[PDB]
Amino acid sequence: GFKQDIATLRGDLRTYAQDIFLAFLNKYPDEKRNFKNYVGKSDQELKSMAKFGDHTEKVFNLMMEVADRATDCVPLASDASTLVQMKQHSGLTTGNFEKLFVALVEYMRASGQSFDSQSWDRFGKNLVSALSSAGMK
Numbered sequence: 157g158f159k160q161d162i163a164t165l166r167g168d169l170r171t172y173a174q175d176i177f178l179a180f181l182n183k184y185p186d187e188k189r190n191f192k193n194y195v196g197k198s199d200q201e202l203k204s205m206a207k208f209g210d211h212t213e214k215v216f217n218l219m220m221e222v223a224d225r226a227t228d229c230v231p232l233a234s235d236a237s238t239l240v241q242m243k244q245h246s247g248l249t250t251g252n253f254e255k256l257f258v259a260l261v262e263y264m265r266a267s268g269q270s271f272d273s274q275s276w277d278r279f280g281k282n283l284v285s286a287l288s289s290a291g292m293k
């Protein structure tokens with residue numbers, strides 16, 4: 157289920173983080189609008205870029221902590237508040253996060269592996285609600 161999925165993703169986190177974030181940026185190419193230096197790069201080129209590796213690993217390091225601290229796929233209000241309050245997320249709306257979780261669920265569905273895709277779908281929706289409650293537009 158959900159907790160085991162966190163362990164699976166942590167076990168190869170750099171590769172899952174890059175593959176899932178690339179699935180997001182390829183499904184919703186307009187989200188590259190939020191990351192200038194990503195436009196006109198292939199996936200291999202992005203994976204070469206220091207900053208891409210470091211942003212995407214920090215995103216998934218913290219996401220896995222938020223999933224880990226959740227009860228039954230409901231994240232802590234404190235985690236939502238932290239994500240809203242981050243200066244790096246100043247321009248963002250809940251829709252950005254919704255799209256990341258849609259791509260993550262599709263990635264899991266397409267994988268040969270027994271991820272609990274329905275639990276990640278619920279976790280995404282719960283996180284979007286929490287972010288709205290914590291003040292995200």
Ligand code: HEM
Nearest residue numbers: 187190191210211214215216218219244245248252253256
């Ligand atoms: C649960 C989801 C997410 C988590 C846990 C998260 C976490 C983080 C973390 C920890 C950083 C600091 C990393 C760094 O600059 O070293 C960061 C930066 C950033 N995040 Fe998020 N993030 C999430 C979703 C998103 C989404 C959906 C977007 C845009 C669509 C976004 C845009 C950014 C941007 C632009 C930065 C700074 C730019 C850069 O990477 O150099 N994040 N995020």
